[PDB]
Amino acid sequence: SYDSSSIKVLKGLDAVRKRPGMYIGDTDDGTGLHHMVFEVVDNAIDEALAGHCKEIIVTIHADNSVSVQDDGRGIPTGIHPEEGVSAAEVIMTVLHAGGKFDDNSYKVSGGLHGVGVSVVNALSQKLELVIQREGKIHRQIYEHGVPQAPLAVTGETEKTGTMVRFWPSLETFTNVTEFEYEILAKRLRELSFLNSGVSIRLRDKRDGKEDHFHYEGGIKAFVEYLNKNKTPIHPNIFYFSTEKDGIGVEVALQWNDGFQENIYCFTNNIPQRDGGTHLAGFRAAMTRTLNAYMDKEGYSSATGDDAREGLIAVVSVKVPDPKFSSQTKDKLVSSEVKSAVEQQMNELLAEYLLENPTDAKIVVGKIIDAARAREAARRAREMT
Amino acid sequence: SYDSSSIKVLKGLDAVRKRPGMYIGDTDDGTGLHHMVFEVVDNAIDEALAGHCKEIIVTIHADNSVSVQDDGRGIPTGIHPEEGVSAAEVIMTVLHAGGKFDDNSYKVSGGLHGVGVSVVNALSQKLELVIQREGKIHRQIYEHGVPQAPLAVTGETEKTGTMVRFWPSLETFTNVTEFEYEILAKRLRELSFLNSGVSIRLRDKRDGKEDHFHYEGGIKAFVEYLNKNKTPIHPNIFYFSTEKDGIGVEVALQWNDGFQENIYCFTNNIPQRDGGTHLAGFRAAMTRTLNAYMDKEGYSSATGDDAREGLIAVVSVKVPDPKFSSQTKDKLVSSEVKSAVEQQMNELLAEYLLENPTDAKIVVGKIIDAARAREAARRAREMT
Numbered sequence: 138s139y140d141s142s143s144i145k146v147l148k149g150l151d152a153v154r155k156r157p158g159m160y161i162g163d164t165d166d167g168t169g170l171h172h173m174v175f176e177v178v179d180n181a182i183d184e185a186l187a188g189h190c191k192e193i194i195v196t197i198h199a200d201n202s203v204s205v206q207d208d209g210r211g212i213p214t215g216i217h218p219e220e221g222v223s224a225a226e227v228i229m230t231v232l233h234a235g236g237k238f239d240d241n242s243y244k245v246s247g248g249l250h251g252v253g254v255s256v257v258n259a260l261s262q263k264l265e266l267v268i269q270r271e272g273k274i275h276r277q278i279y280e281h282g283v284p285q286a287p288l289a290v291t292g293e294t295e296k297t298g299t300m301v302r303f304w305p306s307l308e309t310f311t312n313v314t315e316f317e318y319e320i321l322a323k324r325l326r327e328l329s330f331l332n333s334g335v336s337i338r339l340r341d342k343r344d345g346k347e348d349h350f351h352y353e354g355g356i357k358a359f360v361e362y363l364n365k366n367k368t369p370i371h372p373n374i375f376y377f378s379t380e381k382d383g384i385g386v387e388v389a390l391q392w393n394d395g396f397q398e399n400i401y402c403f404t405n406n407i408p409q410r411d412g413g414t415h416l417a418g419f420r421a422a423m424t425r426t427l428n429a430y431m432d433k434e435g436y437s438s439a440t441g442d443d444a445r446e447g448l449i450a451v452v453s454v455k456v457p458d459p460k461f462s463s464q465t466k467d468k469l470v471s472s473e474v475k476s477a478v479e480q481q482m483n484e485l486l487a488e489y490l491l492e493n494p495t496d497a498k499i500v501v502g503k504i505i506d507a508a509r510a511r512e513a514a515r516r517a518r519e520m521t
Numbered sequence: 522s523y524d525s526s527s528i529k530v531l532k533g534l535d536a537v538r539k540r541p542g543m544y545i546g547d548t549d550d551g552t553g554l555h556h557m558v559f560e561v562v563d564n565a566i567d568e569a570l571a572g573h574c575k576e577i578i579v580t581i582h583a584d585n586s587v588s589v590q591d592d593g594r595g596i597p598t599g600i601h602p603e604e605g606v607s608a609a610e611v612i613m614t615v616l617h618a619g620g621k622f623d624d625n626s627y628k629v630s631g632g633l634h635g636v637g638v639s640v641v642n643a644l645s646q647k648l649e650l651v652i653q654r655e656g657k658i659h660r661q662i663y664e665h666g667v668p669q670a671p672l673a674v675t676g677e678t679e680k681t682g683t684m685v686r687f688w689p690s691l692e693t694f695t696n697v698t699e700f701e702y703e704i705l706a707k708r709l710r711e712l713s714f715l716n717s718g719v720s721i722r723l724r725d726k727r728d729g730k731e732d733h734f735h736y737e738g739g740i741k742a743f744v745e746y747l748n749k750n751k752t753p754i755h756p757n758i759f760y761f762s763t764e765k766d767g768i769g770v771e772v773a774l775q776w777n778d779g780f781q782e783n784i785y786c787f788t789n790n791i792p793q794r795d796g797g798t799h800l801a802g803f804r805a806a807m808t809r810t811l812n813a814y815m816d817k818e819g820y821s822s823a824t825g826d827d828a829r830e831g832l833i834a835v836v837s838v839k840v841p842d843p844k845f846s847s848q849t850k851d852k853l854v855s856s857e858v859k860s861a862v863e864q865q866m867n868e869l870l871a872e873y874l875l876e877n878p879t880d881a882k883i884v885v886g887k888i889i890d891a892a893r894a895r896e897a898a899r900r901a902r903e904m905t
């Protein structure tokens with residue numbers, strides 16, 4: 138019988154537990170599990186982007202919980218006037234709630250859905266929240282997303298910040314159920330390059346291992362790091378940072394003598410594993426600018442792919458209201474970011490090639506060589 | 522000032538309009554726009570999967586609206602006892618609401634989030650809902666997701682079914698703002714192959730064009746269709762349909778003399794453009810089964826990629842509670858579907874190769890040839 142009684146409304150966080158795939162991703166291969174950590178970290182990085190947090194500490198505890206401490210402003214603790222409970226609890230228990238739906242609290246932020254930390258809460262058998270703010274320490278415990286008591290003041294402090302510790306629920310997560318140091322370290326190292334002046338620490342209480350990431354030199358240094366085990370073919374990394382029409386575009390790149398393409402794309406510091414409009418705009422401008430240079434210099438047929446070979450690049454954009462296809466933010470779907478990246482790249486890469494003739498000639502040589510190897514491969518296939 | 526007043530809770534459908542990327546995808550390239558249609562169509566297909574709908578009519582109207590009529594059970598119209606309005610209105614105005622959170626109303630369904638048609642509503646400047654059910658016609662109008670009046674009875678009928686017509690909001694959608702016949706037709710043709718016995722019609726009132734899709738022969742015929750403009754190299758399409766441990770696995774495939782790989786993956790009839798665990802399980806079993814055969818027959822080095830070349834395949838699974846990474850369901854993230862597809866493929870493909878020696882020998886020849894062309898290409902690159 139299919140009728141009004143067959144229609145069910147899921148309340149509170151029940152939808153997150155019922156359909157975890159659309160909130161956390163894969164609950165069996167480990168990617169979702171680590172994403173729980175990254176949601177919490179991304180909120181601390183957003184305080185850093187806002188100018189209020191200079192230290193983030195991520196700890197893997199010996200009981201397979203993870204904590205993230207920041208020295209930012211603290212999650213607001215006062216009673217929410219419409220909801221009638223602490224704003225912190227509203228944040229933990231309600232989907233599409235937060236401070237990132239306008240630009241008053243965070244000019245730019247990776248956060249935008251008002252979902253992240255409520256997902257972590259919903260899919261955790263236990264979550265501990267400690268907030269330092271307005272001279273007071275506040276604490277609250279949750280179990281499977283359910284607060285055990287209202288947020289309470291437990292003492293005094295001269296500090297500000299948020300600490301979230303969570304124990305992931307094995308009723309949701311399967312197979313890969315323990316945290317992997319290196320997965321966290323890769324992300325935190327990257328965030329250090331992307332956030333100069335922010336101290337990021339990682340501690341594993343299981344074995345005493347620790348790292349302190351505080352790289353200087355930003356995404357240019359990031360490119361050096363990435364080309365470390367490779368062989369750069371020209372000495373001058375191309376780099377710029379601009380802010381035009383409300384969009385920040387920061388790019389660094391350098392070619393190596395290998396044959397892969399590795400473009401790392403970021404939007405408000407969140408990586409897009411599956412690319413997007415920023416990657417689309419980067420590719421377009423590279424192709425156009427290189428072809429124009431080769432045409433003008435009489436070196437001209439190479440396609441976009443030949444310029445891709447041996448390339449390492451980092452594309453980092455800062456956008457007031459970006460659009461992602463999902464909560465995990467694997468893909469940027471904002472058409473105006475394509476235009477901003479393409480426009481800035483076309484202007485500044487053309488200037489780089491004029492100002493750095495030695496590099497320009499090496500890169501042209503590489504593009505020609507990649508095109509030659511591609512045609513030889515095609516001919517060889519046809520002849521088998 | 523960052524405090525409890527800075528924390529905003531988005532109510533009703535406001536989150537969909539504020540953050541359309543996570544609900545509909547790209548709002549500028551046309552993919553999101555057409556996805557609005559597919560959400561509505563997917564609900565009609567779910568009535569077809571349940572055994573209650575035999576005809577679906579999709580019309581592109583001359584005012585750039587689209588309607589979808591089905592002859593299924595009709596969206597329930599009675600007052601929802603907890604919500605206090607018609608179940609239909611609950612469905613249109615509330616996220617995470619519907620009849621697909623258990624298996625009572627739909628044993629298997631592409632729908633699972635309770636979100637789809639509320640998204641279409643939220644991002645439409647106007648939506649018209651007509652429901653035929655319990656001897657009555659019911660009608661309701663919405664504007665930007667807001668019902669203009671409670672669902673009302675407007676007459677009598679011997680029929681059952683749902684008609685949704687929507688006019689997409691240009692405050693959300695940009696650039697590609699008109700519907701493209703061929704985009705809809707591709708999806709509907711595919712659904713006809715996947716749903717034998719369901720009449721699917723497409724009408725464009727702009728120019729009078731129409732199609733009636735009612736293919737027989739299912740996914741095997743689908744493979745014939747896909748290999749039409751290509752050159753199949755062996756005459757017997759591999760095909761099976763099984764249901765084991767609550768999971769349906771249906772596969773068809775055939776090699777052609779080209780060099781691409783085209784695997785079409787579906788879960789409860791929804792395509793995964795970005796693949797998933799079903800695609801992962803298909804690839805694994807193909808590689809294992811082919812290698813075992815070549816080993817046993819003394820034809821054995823070919824990798825997974827060589828078997829991929831020239832392949833057209835359709836993998837269609839039926840799963841009680843699948844897991845997708847997003848509302849657009851581009852990727853299946855359910856590890857137990859990997860195992861089901863891998864297991865069934867290994868058994869049945871091995872039997873196919875034993876029972877069809879002429880085909881088996883042709884395919885082995887193709888794999889060897891692809892491996893030969895791949896090594897020649899590699900050598901040619903190295904030597905440039």
Ligand SMILES: Nc1ncnc2c1ncn2[C@@H]1O[C@H](COP(=O)(O)OP(=O)(O)NP(=O)(O)O)[C@@H](O)[C@H]1O
Nearest residue numbers: 180211212235236237248249250251252253254299
């Ligand atoms: N470490 C923190 N310090 C201060 N405020 C925080 C912190 N973590 C969360 N918040 C606040 O809590 C809100 C909700 O966080 P969260 O559920 O992650 O959603 P969001 O960051 O707004 N968006 P998203 O992560 O994309 O879903 C944020 O918008 C902030 O207002």
Ligand SMILES: Nc1ncnc2c1ncn2[C@@H]1O[C@H](COP(=O)(O)OP(=O)(O)NP(=O)(O)O)[C@@H](O)[C@H]1O
Nearest residue numbers: 564595596619620621632633634635636637638683
């Ligand atoms: N054409 C239809 N005929 C009958 N019932 C329908 C139809 N369309 C929608 N429904 C009902 O309305 C509910 C909500 O539909 P919808 O918002 O699309 O979410 P869903 O199909 O349940 N899941 P999802 O599409 O993945 O978000 C469904 O679960 C059905 O109970």
Ligand SMILES: [Cl-]
Nearest residue numbers: 140141598599
């Ligand atoms: Cl009813």
Ligand SMILES: [Cl-]
Nearest residue numbers: 214215524525
């Ligand atoms: Cl406050």
Ligand SMILES: [Mg+2]
Nearest residue numbers: 180248253254
């Ligand atoms: Mg967040």
Ligand SMILES: [Mg+2]
Nearest residue numbers: 564632637638
């Ligand atoms: Mg649906």
Ligand code: NA
Nearest residue numbers: 228231251255
């Ligand atoms: Na929340």
Ligand code: NA
Nearest residue numbers: 237238239240
């Ligand atoms: Na914002």
Ligand code: NA
Nearest residue numbers: 612615635639
């Ligand atoms: Na809904």
Ligand code: NA
Nearest residue numbers: 621622623624
């Ligand atoms: Na279901």
